[PDB]
Amino acid sequence: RLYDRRSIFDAVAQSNCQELESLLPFLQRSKKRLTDSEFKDPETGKTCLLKAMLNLHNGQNDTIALLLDVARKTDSLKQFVNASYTDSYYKGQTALHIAIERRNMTLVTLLVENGADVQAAANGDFFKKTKFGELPLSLAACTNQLAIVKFLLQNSWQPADISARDSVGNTVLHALVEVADNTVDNTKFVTSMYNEILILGAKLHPTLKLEEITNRKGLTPLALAASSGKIGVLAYILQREIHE
């Protein structure tokens, strides 16, 4: 009949609802909400949904489901599902991001249909270059996740902005170029995903001049490849760029 940060986090990660059974009335009666400070790790920002996203057997976590649901019934749902990591390492990350990272269609769908921002920028160190993509779109795109990419743009609940730009003004095409490392297998996949995107550049916005967008440096996706030295892809872009 009561719950604290750990109590919930415990069951969520344990992946059981018998101990979550009755979370709503606590929140109802205590007028506390999963959203406010108490139920977050100030260090990171892990909300109980975010713990759930990390802990999942075979891709399953029935917690996620009777959790967005308990969040929805408590007047905090858009706020709850878009919660990102307050830290400097995993800065932008939302529930949605992880679902895409973890290549989970069933979870990425049961998430945006509960109102996940499909424009949330993965702002942290984790996504940056030190050894892109940044946007749920550009991410799925770059991870080779076409089945999800389509779901993002062609979405009935919330369309992904196909011509969006991250910090450093990079679109999905830029992102792809940025990922081309010249391997037989790499060039192939980037080429395909590139093509596929431009094809959806027909059905959804036959009006958009997508090939022509400039990043913060001021390069077209082609112009990037030219300097970036991704010769394989540059050849594709140019070759296709002649209607076949």
Ligand X SMILES: Nc1ncnc2c1ncn2[C@@H]1O[C@H](COP(=O)(O)OP(=O)(O)OP(=O)(O)O)[C@@H](O)[C@H]1O
- Distance linking the first and last C-alpha atoms of the chain: 65
- Asked whether position 8 contacts ligand X by CB under 6 A, the answer is no
54 lines the binding site for ligand X (CB under 6 A) = yes
In whole angstroms, the minimum distance from the beta carbon of 232 to ligand X comes to 30
Shortest Cβ 231–ligand X spacing (Å): 33
What values do phi and psi take at 94, rounded to 5?
-115, 165
Q: Does position 86 bind ligand X by CB under 6 A?
A: no
Q: Nearest residue by C-beta to ligand X?
A: 54
Which ranges of 73-206 does DSSP label H, i.e. alpha helix? 78-81, 95-101, 105-112, 136-142, 146-153, 172-177, 184-203
Is 88 a binder of ligand X (CB under 6 A)?
no
For the bound state, the minimum distance from the C-beta of residue 216 to ligand X, rounded and expressed in Å, comes to 25
Would you count residue 51 as binding ligand X (CB under 6 A)? yes
Q: Look at phi and psi of residue 58 and say left if phi exceeds 0, alpha if psi is from -120 to 50, else beta.
A: left
Closer residue to ligand X (CB): 127 or 194:
127
Q: How far is the CB of 13 from ligand X (least distance, A)?
A: 5
Amino acid at 115: G
Applying CB under 6 A, among 93, 114, 138, 220 the residue interacting with ligand X is 93
> Which segment (51-59, 60-68, 215-223, 233-241) binds ligand X by CB under 6 A?
51-59
Question: Does residue 231 interact with ligand X by CB under 6 A?
Answer: no
CB-based contacts of 181, cutoff 8 Å, min separation 6: 230
Structure tokens at 196: 């596929």
One residue of 68, 83, 98, 193 binding ligand X per CB under 6 A = 98
State how far the alpha carbon of 123 is from the alpha carbons of 86, 90, 183, 232, in Å.
Answer: 10, 7, 28, 29
Residues 123, 134: Cα–Cα separation, whole Å: 7
Q: Does 168 bind ligand X (CB under 6 A)?
A: no
- # residues contacting ligand X (CB under 6 A): 8
Contacting positions for ligand X (CB under 6 A): 13, 51, 54-55, 90, 93, 98, 101
